[PDB]
PDB file of C-alpha atoms in Angstrom:
ATOM      1  CA  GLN A   1     -36.853 -12.816  -7.232  1.00 13.69           C
ATOM      2  CA  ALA A   2     -34.285 -12.686  -4.321  1.00 14.34           C
ATOM      3  CA  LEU A   3     -31.564 -15.215  -3.596  1.00 12.48           C
ATOM      4  CA  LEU A   4     -29.084 -15.704  -0.829  1.00 15.20           C
ATOM      5  CA  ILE A   5     -25.910 -17.765  -1.097  1.00 15.84           C
ATOM      6  CA  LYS A   6     -24.337 -18.601   2.257  1.00 15.63           C
ATOM      7  CA  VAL A   7     -20.606 -19.272   2.274  1.00 14.37           C
ATOM      8  CA  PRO A   8     -19.675 -20.567   5.739  1.00 14.91           C
ATOM      9  CA  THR A   9     -16.079 -21.185   4.642  1.00 13.41           C
ATOM     10  CA  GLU A  10     -14.089 -19.223   2.060  1.00 13.96           C
ATOM     11  CA  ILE A  11     -10.385 -20.027   1.821  1.00 16.81           C
ATOM     12  CA  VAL A  12      -7.716 -17.699   0.566  1.00 13.00           C
ATOM     13  CA  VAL A  13      -5.642 -20.077  -1.567  1.00 13.01           C
ATOM     14  CA  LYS A  14      -3.156 -17.558  -2.995  1.00 13.31           C
ATOM     15  CA  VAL A  15      -2.497 -13.942  -1.998  1.00 12.07           C
ATOM     16  CA  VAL A  16       0.256 -11.587  -3.054  1.00 11.01           C
ATOM     17  CA  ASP A  17       0.260  -8.320  -1.139  1.00 13.06           C
ATOM     18  CA  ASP A  18       2.289  -5.621   0.514  1.00 16.83           C
ATOM     19  CA  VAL A  19      -0.143  -4.853   3.293  1.00 18.44           C
ATOM     20  CA  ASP A  20       1.216  -4.522   6.781  1.00 19.74           C
ATOM     21  CA  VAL A  21      -1.810  -5.919   8.653  1.00 19.08           C
ATOM     22  CA  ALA A  22      -0.616  -4.426  11.975  1.00 19.57           C
ATOM     23  CA  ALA A  23      -0.206  -0.929  10.445  1.00 21.95           C
ATOM     24  CA  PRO A  24      -1.799  -0.748   6.988  1.00 22.88           C
ATOM     25  CA  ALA A  25      -1.109   2.200   4.742  1.00 21.13           C
ATOM     26  CA  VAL A  26      -2.461   4.075   1.781  1.00 18.93           C
ATOM     27  CA  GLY A  27      -1.098   2.635  -1.468  1.00 21.03           C
ATOM     28  CA  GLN A  28      -0.782  -0.965  -0.233  1.00 21.95           C
ATOM     29  CA  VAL A  29      -2.292  -3.512  -2.523  1.00 23.33           C
ATOM     30  CA  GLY A  30      -3.224  -7.190  -2.827  1.00 23.81           C
ATOM     31  CA  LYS A  31      -4.253  -9.780  -5.375  1.00 24.16           C
ATOM     32  CA  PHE A  32      -6.071 -12.919  -4.261  1.00 23.90           C
ATOM     33  CA  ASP A  33      -7.646 -16.203  -5.281  1.00 24.26           C
ATOM     34  CA  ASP A  34     -10.202 -17.888  -3.048  1.00 20.96           C
ATOM     35  CA  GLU A  35     -12.243 -21.047  -2.944  1.00 17.87           C
ATOM     36  CA  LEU A  36     -15.816 -21.025  -1.604  1.00 19.00           C
ATOM     37  CA  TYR A  37     -17.429 -23.890   0.360  1.00 17.11           C
ATOM     38  CA  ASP A  38     -20.941 -24.757   1.528  1.00 13.89           C
ATOM     39  CA  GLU A  39     -22.060 -26.081   4.959  1.00 11.99           C
ATOM     40  CA  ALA A  40     -21.134 -29.683   3.887  1.00 11.86           C
ATOM     41  CA  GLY A  41     -17.609 -28.776   2.746  1.00  9.64           C
ATOM     42  CA  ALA A  42     -18.399 -28.999  -0.957  1.00 15.39           C
ATOM     43  CA  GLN A  43     -16.682 -26.412  -3.168  1.00 12.39           C
ATOM     44  CA  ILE A  44     -19.260 -24.085  -4.712  1.00 10.64           C
ATOM     45  CA  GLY A  45     -17.003 -21.583  -6.453  1.00 11.04           C
ATOM     46  CA  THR A  46     -13.851 -19.549  -6.626  1.00  9.53           C
ATOM     47  CA  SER A  47     -13.021 -15.866  -6.621  1.00  8.24           C
ATOM     48  CA  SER A  48     -10.214 -14.007  -8.181  1.00  8.44           C
ATOM     49  CA  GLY A  49      -9.694 -10.291  -7.308  1.00  5.32           C
ATOM     50  CA  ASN A  50      -7.568  -7.428  -6.116  1.00  8.18           C
ATOM     51  CA  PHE A  51      -7.651  -4.470  -3.740  1.00 14.06           C
ATOM     52  CA  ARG A  52      -5.896  -1.197  -3.045  1.00 15.05           C
ATOM     53  CA  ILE A  53      -5.907   0.965   0.076  1.00 16.98           C
ATOM     54  CA  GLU A  54      -6.862   4.386  -1.437  1.00 15.62           C
ATOM     55  CA  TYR A  55      -7.391   6.963   1.319  1.00 14.97           C
ATOM     56  CA  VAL A  56      -8.035   7.493   5.034  1.00 16.14           C
ATOM     57  CA  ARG A  57     -11.559   8.549   5.923  1.00 17.81           C
ATOM     58  CA  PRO A  58     -11.073  11.810   7.923  1.00 17.42           C
ATOM     59  CA  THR A  59     -13.872  11.451  10.375  1.00 20.09           C
ATOM     60  CA  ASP A  60     -12.689   8.191  11.964  1.00 18.27           C
ATOM     61  CA  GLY A  61      -9.441   7.080  10.365  1.00 18.74           C
ATOM     62  CA  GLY A  62     -11.100   4.308   8.318  1.00 17.34           C
ATOM     63  CA  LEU A  63      -8.653   2.814   5.789  1.00 15.99           C
ATOM     64  CA  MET A  64     -10.702   2.996   2.667  1.00 15.49           C
ATOM     65  CA  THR A  65      -9.953   0.195   0.319  1.00 16.32           C
ATOM     66  CA  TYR A  66     -11.309  -0.522  -3.146  1.00 14.90           C
ATOM     67  CA  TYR A  67     -11.964  -4.197  -3.881  1.00 16.47           C
ATOM     68  CA  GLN A  68     -12.694  -5.769  -7.318  1.00 14.70           C
ATOM     69  CA  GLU A  69     -13.358  -9.444  -7.948  1.00 11.42           C
ATOM     70  CA  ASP A  70     -15.023 -11.973 -10.147  1.00  8.87           C
ATOM     71  CA  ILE A  71     -16.746 -14.774  -8.341  1.00  9.53           C
ATOM     72  CA  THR A  72     -17.206 -17.949 -10.395  1.00 10.70           C
ATOM     73  CA  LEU A  73     -19.861 -20.192  -9.002  1.00  7.60           C
ATOM     74  CA  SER A  74     -20.844 -23.536 -10.530  1.00 11.29           C
ATOM     75  CA  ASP A  75     -23.941 -21.905 -12.161  1.00 10.31           C
ATOM     76  CA  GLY A  76     -22.647 -18.441 -13.193  1.00 11.24           C
ATOM     77  CA  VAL A  77     -20.289 -15.521 -12.569  1.00 11.15           C
ATOM     78  CA  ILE A  78     -20.886 -12.442 -10.298  1.00 13.17           C
ATOM     79  CA  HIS A  79     -18.653  -9.402 -10.503  1.00  9.02           C
ATOM     80  CA  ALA A  80     -18.327  -7.421  -7.225  1.00  9.05           C
ATOM     81  CA  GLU A  81     -16.496  -4.183  -6.592  1.00 11.59           C
ATOM     82  CA  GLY A  82     -16.506  -1.287  -4.144  1.00 11.89           C
ATOM     83  CA  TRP A  83     -15.329   0.080  -0.875  1.00 15.70           C
ATOM     84  CA  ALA A  84     -14.402  -1.495   2.483  1.00 15.67           C
ATOM     85  CA  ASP A  85     -12.692  -0.185   5.646  1.00 11.39           C
ATOM     86  CA  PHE A  86      -9.524  -2.195   6.038  1.00 12.26           C
ATOM     87  CA  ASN A  87      -9.798  -1.715   9.858  1.00 11.97           C
ATOM     88  CA  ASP A  88     -13.002  -3.686   9.653  1.00  9.25           C
ATOM     89  CA  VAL A  89     -11.267  -6.284   7.450  1.00  6.39           C
ATOM     90  CA  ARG A  90      -8.357  -6.808   9.860  1.00  4.25           C
ATOM     91  CA  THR A  91     -10.607  -6.959  12.952  1.00  3.40           C
ATOM     92  CA  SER A  92     -12.937  -9.669  11.669  1.00  3.18           C
ATOM     93  CA  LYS A  93     -15.947  -7.323  11.072  1.00  3.01           C
ATOM     94  CA  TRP A  94     -18.302  -7.725   8.100  1.00  2.00           C
ATOM     95  CA  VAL A  95     -17.585  -5.682   4.971  1.00  3.21           C
ATOM     96  CA  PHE A  96     -19.681  -5.393   1.813  1.00  2.00           C
ATOM     97  CA  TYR A  97     -19.860  -3.948  -1.683  1.00  3.27           C
ATOM     98  CA  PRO A  98     -22.146  -4.131  -4.744  1.00  2.00           C
ATOM     99  CA  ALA A  99     -22.318  -7.145  -6.958  1.00  3.04           C
ATOM    100  CA  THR A 100     -23.616  -7.490 -10.478  1.00  2.98           C
ATOM    101  CA  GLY A 101     -24.563 -10.837 -12.070  1.00  2.00           C
ATOM    102  CA  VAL A 102     -22.415 -11.418 -15.190  1.00  2.00           C
ATOM    103  CA  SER A 103     -23.574 -14.876 -16.420  1.00  2.20           C
ATOM    104  CA  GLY A 104     -25.662 -17.916 -15.938  1.00  4.42           C
ATOM    105  CA  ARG A 105     -28.122 -17.977 -13.116  1.00  5.60           C
ATOM    106  CA  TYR A 106     -27.079 -14.404 -12.167  1.00  9.11           C
ATOM    107  CA  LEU A 107     -27.550 -12.620 -15.444  1.00  7.80           C
ATOM    108  CA  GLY A 108     -29.789  -9.602 -14.898  1.00 11.07           C
ATOM    109  CA  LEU A 109     -29.476  -9.753 -11.063  1.00 12.92           C
ATOM    110  CA  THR A 110     -27.782  -7.216  -8.832  1.00 13.94           C
ATOM    111  CA  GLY A 111     -27.033  -7.166  -5.155  1.00 12.16           C
ATOM    112  CA  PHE A 112     -24.210  -7.319  -2.645  1.00 14.02           C
ATOM    113  CA  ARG A 113     -21.137  -9.306  -1.775  1.00 14.43           C
ATOM    114  CA  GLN A 114     -20.388  -9.522   1.977  1.00 12.04           C
ATOM    115  CA  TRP A 115     -17.588 -11.210   3.840  1.00 13.35           C
ATOM    116  CA  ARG A 116     -15.720 -11.243   7.133  1.00 12.91           C
ATOM    117  CA  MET A 117     -12.185 -12.432   7.770  1.00 11.53           C
ATOM    118  CA  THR A 118     -11.886 -15.271  10.182  1.00 12.72           C
ATOM    119  CA  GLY A 119      -8.124 -15.992   9.475  1.00 10.58           C
ATOM    120  CA  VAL A 120      -5.507 -13.515   8.183  1.00 12.54           C
ATOM    121  CA  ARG A 121      -4.534 -14.332   4.578  1.00 11.61           C
ATOM    122  CA  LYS A 122      -6.334 -17.712   4.943  1.00 11.04           C
ATOM    123  CA  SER A 123     -10.082 -17.782   5.799  1.00 13.47           C
ATOM    124  CA  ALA A 124     -13.407 -15.895   5.754  1.00 10.88           C
ATOM    125  CA  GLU A 125     -17.163 -16.368   5.928  1.00 14.04           C
ATOM    126  CA  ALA A 126     -19.346 -14.740   3.212  1.00 13.40           C
ATOM    127  CA  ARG A 127     -22.845 -14.056   1.905  1.00 14.51           C
ATOM    128  CA  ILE A 128     -23.949 -13.108  -1.586  1.00 16.43           C
ATOM    129  CA  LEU A 129     -27.445 -11.501  -1.686  1.00 16.28           C
ATOM    130  CA  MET A 130     -29.038 -10.828  -5.105  1.00 16.55           C
ATOM    131  CA  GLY A 131     -32.371  -9.777  -6.551  1.00 15.74           C
TER     132      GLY A 131
ATOM    133  CA  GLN B   1     -34.457 -17.087   3.224  1.00 14.15           C
ATOM    134  CA  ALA B   2     -34.066 -13.893   0.994  1.00 16.54           C
ATOM    135  CA  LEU B   3     -36.623 -11.182   0.292  1.00 17.10           C
ATOM    136  CA  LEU B   4     -36.839  -8.248  -2.116  1.00 17.91           C
ATOM    137  CA  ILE B   5     -39.273  -5.301  -1.582  1.00 18.10           C
ATOM    138  CA  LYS B   6     -39.636  -3.144  -4.671  1.00 17.69           C
ATOM    139  CA  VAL B   7     -40.721   0.493  -4.098  1.00 18.13           C
ATOM    140  CA  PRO B   8     -41.464   1.961  -7.458  1.00 14.30           C
ATOM    141  CA  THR B   9     -42.545   5.301  -5.906  1.00 10.98           C
ATOM    142  CA  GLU B  10     -41.278   6.774  -2.670  1.00  9.95           C
ATOM    143  CA  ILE B  11     -42.449  10.304  -1.868  1.00 12.89           C
ATOM    144  CA  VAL B  12     -40.642  12.749   0.410  1.00  8.96           C
ATOM    145  CA  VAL B  13     -43.509  14.181   2.385  1.00  9.45           C
ATOM    146  CA  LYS B  14     -41.483  16.521   4.582  1.00 10.15           C
ATOM    147  CA  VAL B  15     -37.827  17.581   4.304  1.00 12.85           C
ATOM    148  CA  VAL B  16     -35.959  20.197   6.320  1.00 12.47           C
ATOM    149  CA  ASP B  17     -32.462  20.753   5.015  1.00 12.23           C
ATOM    150  CA  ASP B  18     -29.742  23.285   4.203  1.00 10.90           C
ATOM    151  CA  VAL B  19     -28.221  21.473   1.211  1.00 11.56           C
ATOM    152  CA  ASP B  20     -27.471  23.475  -1.907  1.00  9.32           C
ATOM    153  CA  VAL B  21     -28.241  20.755  -4.470  1.00  9.74           C
ATOM    154  CA  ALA B  22     -26.339  22.669  -7.244  1.00  9.83           C
ATOM    155  CA  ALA B  23     -23.175  22.958  -5.113  1.00  7.19           C
ATOM    156  CA  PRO B  24     -23.440  20.772  -2.062  1.00 10.16           C
ATOM    157  CA  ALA B  25     -20.977  21.156   0.765  1.00 11.00           C
ATOM    158  CA  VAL B  26     -19.590  19.471   3.782  1.00 11.62           C
ATOM    159  CA  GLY B  27     -21.646  20.183   6.897  1.00 15.13           C
ATOM    160  CA  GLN B  28     -25.014  20.445   5.105  1.00 15.24           C
ATOM    161  CA  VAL B  29     -27.695  18.303   6.645  1.00 11.32           C
ATOM    162  CA  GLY B  30     -31.294  17.126   6.145  1.00 14.24           C
ATOM    163  CA  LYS B  31     -34.140  15.458   7.981  1.00 16.13           C
ATOM    164  CA  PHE B  32     -36.863  13.670   6.030  1.00 15.97           C
ATOM    165  CA  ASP B  33     -40.093  11.751   6.238  1.00 12.44           C
ATOM    166  CA  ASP B  34     -41.154   9.600   3.315  1.00 14.16           C
ATOM    167  CA  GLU B  35     -44.096   7.401   2.253  1.00 10.19           C
ATOM    168  CA  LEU B  36     -43.481   4.226   0.254  1.00  7.53           C
ATOM    169  CA  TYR B  37     -45.889   3.049  -2.478  1.00 10.64           C
ATOM    170  CA  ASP B  38     -46.386  -0.096  -4.511  1.00 10.71           C
ATOM    171  CA  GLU B  39     -47.061  -0.467  -8.294  1.00 10.67           C
ATOM    172  CA  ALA B  40     -50.762   0.195  -7.772  1.00 10.64           C
ATOM    173  CA  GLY B  41     -50.306   3.324  -5.640  1.00 13.27           C
ATOM    174  CA  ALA B  42     -51.085   1.696  -2.361  1.00 10.44           C
ATOM    175  CA  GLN B  43     -49.016   2.803   0.655  1.00 12.55           C
ATOM    176  CA  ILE B  44     -46.734   0.106   1.980  1.00 13.16           C
ATOM    177  CA  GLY B  45     -44.703   2.027   4.511  1.00 14.73           C
ATOM    178  CA  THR B  46     -43.028   5.143   5.753  1.00 12.82           C
ATOM    179  CA  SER B  47     -39.445   6.212   6.618  1.00 13.55           C
ATOM    180  CA  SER B  48     -38.061   8.825   8.927  1.00 13.39           C
ATOM    181  CA  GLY B  49     -34.410   9.738   8.802  1.00 14.81           C
ATOM    182  CA  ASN B  50     -31.615  12.182   8.501  1.00 14.09           C
ATOM    183  CA  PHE B  51     -28.306  12.761   6.729  1.00 12.26           C
ATOM    184  CA  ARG B  52     -25.129  14.839   6.976  1.00 10.79           C
ATOM    185  CA  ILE B  53     -22.553  15.591   4.297  1.00 11.99           C
ATOM    186  CA  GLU B  54     -19.309  14.610   6.169  1.00 10.04           C
ATOM    187  CA  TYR B  55     -16.241  14.673   3.839  1.00  8.21           C
ATOM    188  CA  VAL B  56     -15.002  14.482   0.246  1.00  6.29           C
ATOM    189  CA  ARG B  57     -13.655  11.172  -1.275  1.00  7.82           C
ATOM    190  CA  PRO B  58     -10.504  11.715  -3.513  1.00  9.45           C
ATOM    191  CA  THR B  59     -10.803   9.081  -6.234  1.00  8.48           C
ATOM    192  CA  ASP B  60     -13.980  10.591  -7.669  1.00 10.33           C
ATOM    193  CA  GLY B  61     -14.578  13.796  -5.468  1.00 11.57           C
ATOM    194  CA  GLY B  62     -17.546  12.073  -3.922  1.00 16.64           C
ATOM    195  CA  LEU B  63     -19.507  14.073  -1.423  1.00 20.25           C
ATOM    196  CA  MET B  64     -19.633  11.449   1.280  1.00 18.11           C
ATOM    197  CA  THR B  65     -22.886  11.642   3.213  1.00 20.56           C
ATOM    198  CA  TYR B  66     -23.990   9.547   6.218  1.00 20.91           C
ATOM    199  CA  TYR B  67     -27.674   8.512   6.197  1.00 21.30           C
ATOM    200  CA  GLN B  68     -29.711   7.044   9.058  1.00 19.03           C
ATOM    201  CA  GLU B  69     -33.383   6.040   8.915  1.00 15.93           C
ATOM    202  CA  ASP B  70     -36.035   3.817  10.265  1.00 15.46           C
ATOM    203  CA  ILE B  71     -38.391   2.241   7.728  1.00 14.57           C
ATOM    204  CA  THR B  72     -41.788   1.201   9.008  1.00 15.57           C
ATOM    205  CA  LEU B  73     -43.543  -1.323   6.813  1.00 13.01           C
ATOM    206  CA  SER B  74     -46.953  -2.857   7.440  1.00 12.08           C
ATOM    207  CA  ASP B  75     -45.351  -6.020   8.804  1.00 10.26           C
ATOM    208  CA  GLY B  76     -42.230  -4.741  10.675  1.00 11.65           C
ATOM    209  CA  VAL B  77     -39.457  -2.133  10.996  1.00  9.93           C
ATOM    210  CA  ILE B  78     -36.050  -1.981   9.322  1.00  9.89           C
ATOM    211  CA  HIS B  79     -33.247   0.315  10.413  1.00  8.36           C
ATOM    212  CA  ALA B  80     -30.805   1.459   7.731  1.00  8.53           C
ATOM    213  CA  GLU B  81     -27.692   3.537   7.971  1.00  9.06           C
ATOM    214  CA  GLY B  82     -24.446   4.220   6.174  1.00 10.06           C
ATOM    215  CA  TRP B  83     -22.613   6.124   3.477  1.00 12.15           C
ATOM    216  CA  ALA B  84     -23.731   7.509   0.065  1.00 13.25           C
ATOM    217  CA  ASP B  85     -22.120   9.807  -2.396  1.00 13.16           C
ATOM    218  CA  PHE B  86     -24.275  12.920  -2.682  1.00 11.60           C
ATOM    219  CA  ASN B  87     -23.148  13.440  -6.277  1.00  9.76           C
ATOM    220  CA  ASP B  88     -24.869  10.130  -7.072  1.00  7.14           C
ATOM    221  CA  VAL B  89     -27.899  11.298  -5.057  1.00  6.08           C
ATOM    222  CA  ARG B  90     -28.273  14.592  -6.957  1.00  6.51           C
ATOM    223  CA  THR B  91     -27.632  12.999 -10.439  1.00  7.60           C
ATOM    224  CA  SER B  92     -30.362  10.313  -9.993  1.00  8.41           C
ATOM    225  CA  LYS B  93     -27.979   7.360  -9.609  1.00  7.14           C
ATOM    226  CA  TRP B  94     -28.653   4.460  -7.223  1.00  5.24           C
ATOM    227  CA  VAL B  95     -27.233   4.671  -3.746  1.00  3.03           C
ATOM    228  CA  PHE B  96     -27.209   2.045  -0.967  1.00  2.00           C
ATOM    229  CA  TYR B  97     -26.336   1.311   2.656  1.00  2.00           C
ATOM    230  CA  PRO B  98     -26.848  -1.513   5.086  1.00  2.00           C
ATOM    231  CA  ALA B  99     -30.177  -2.372   6.680  1.00  2.32           C
ATOM    232  CA  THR B 100     -30.958  -4.375   9.803  1.00  2.00           C
ATOM    233  CA  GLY B 101     -34.385  -5.820  10.613  1.00  3.25           C
ATOM    234  CA  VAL B 102     -35.668  -4.424  13.955  1.00  7.60           C
ATOM    235  CA  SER B 103     -39.153  -5.994  14.308  1.00  8.21           C
ATOM    236  CA  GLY B 104     -41.813  -8.208  12.878  1.00  8.53           C
ATOM    237  CA  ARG B 105     -41.199  -9.982   9.630  1.00  7.59           C
ATOM    238  CA  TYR B 106     -37.682  -8.522   9.474  1.00 10.27           C
ATOM    239  CA  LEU B 107     -36.360  -9.575  12.904  1.00 12.24           C
ATOM    240  CA  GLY B 108     -33.047 -11.339  12.487  1.00 12.41           C
ATOM    241  CA  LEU B 109     -32.675 -10.338   8.775  1.00 12.27           C
ATOM    242  CA  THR B 110     -29.951  -8.068   7.436  1.00 11.27           C
ATOM    243  CA  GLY B 111     -29.358  -6.632   4.029  1.00  9.45           C
ATOM    244  CA  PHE B 112     -29.443  -3.418   2.110  1.00  9.29           C
ATOM    245  CA  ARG B 113     -31.546  -0.304   1.581  1.00  9.00           C
ATOM    246  CA  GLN B 114     -31.226   1.125  -1.961  1.00  8.64           C
ATOM    247  CA  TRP B 115     -32.746   4.197  -3.553  1.00  9.37           C
ATOM    248  CA  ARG B 116     -32.492   6.616  -6.447  1.00  8.55           C
ATOM    249  CA  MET B 117     -33.818  10.223  -6.363  1.00  9.26           C
ATOM    250  CA  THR B 118     -36.148  10.908  -9.303  1.00 10.55           C
ATOM    251  CA  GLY B 119     -37.421  14.338  -8.109  1.00 14.67           C
ATOM    252  CA  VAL B 120     -35.370  16.735  -5.978  1.00 11.65           C
ATOM    253  CA  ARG B 121     -36.810  16.845  -2.392  1.00 10.24           C
ATOM    254  CA  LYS B 122     -39.883  14.953  -3.467  1.00  7.40           C
ATOM    255  CA  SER B 123     -39.535  11.573  -5.220  1.00  8.73           C
ATOM    256  CA  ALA B 124     -37.454   8.447  -5.452  1.00  8.71           C
ATOM    257  CA  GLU B 125     -37.598   4.773  -6.322  1.00  9.49           C
ATOM    258  CA  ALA B 126     -36.186   2.144  -3.984  1.00 12.81           C
ATOM    259  CA  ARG B 127     -35.429  -1.484  -3.179  1.00 12.66           C
ATOM    260  CA  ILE B 128     -34.951  -3.267   0.108  1.00 12.16           C
ATOM    261  CA  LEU B 129     -33.049  -6.543  -0.161  1.00 15.17           C
ATOM    262  CA  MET B 130     -32.841  -8.745   2.992  1.00 16.73           C
ATOM    263  CA  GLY B 131     -31.731 -12.288   4.031  1.00 18.34           C
TER     264      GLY B 131
END
């Protein structure tokens, strides 16, 4: 059993944050609510989550940020949390972290939440891959 | 299109390393060759790779290790590389990093390589999840 959910458009509907996107810093935080859409423009879910920039990776200056969210799809909830490099976030590169099925279709499944910013504080593309 | 390959037994056939598993340290490295087995004990692939313990993460003191390998299955090759916390490695917790299909059945697929050490320098279980 493997499943893939493609999310060609994910909209940031509300975000409260103190990130400076041009010069982000350790200790900056954000809280967000998104809406997830399929290839036809139908809404397939929402997400509500938060993040904190925690440390700078010493090898390359990556801005290591801990994300936590609950993704509510029409057929169940998936919790996702883990690490991303905020330099990848702000440069429209893919980021990822583990996801754990909480309810519905996803109970007992585990996998990965992936996304890439396409518009600052407004839009992304995403994939959820579970097994 | 999503696939899950379960590897209930993965055997480390050769490892050359200078890790002290009881007290691992930054700058310790390893090179490994593994064989991957199905539920019946039939061989389904091999991997060849290497790792280096690079830095320590502050939230949890994680011993942040960069892994790189190429996984050769009977029907194609998958490259995997990224970060793992060596304290998870040495305490038999699951670790993961991204995987990219290189050839065959896996060309154009991306996903995740996951494993958990069950015997120091000798055994693991694993999953490869792609889409």
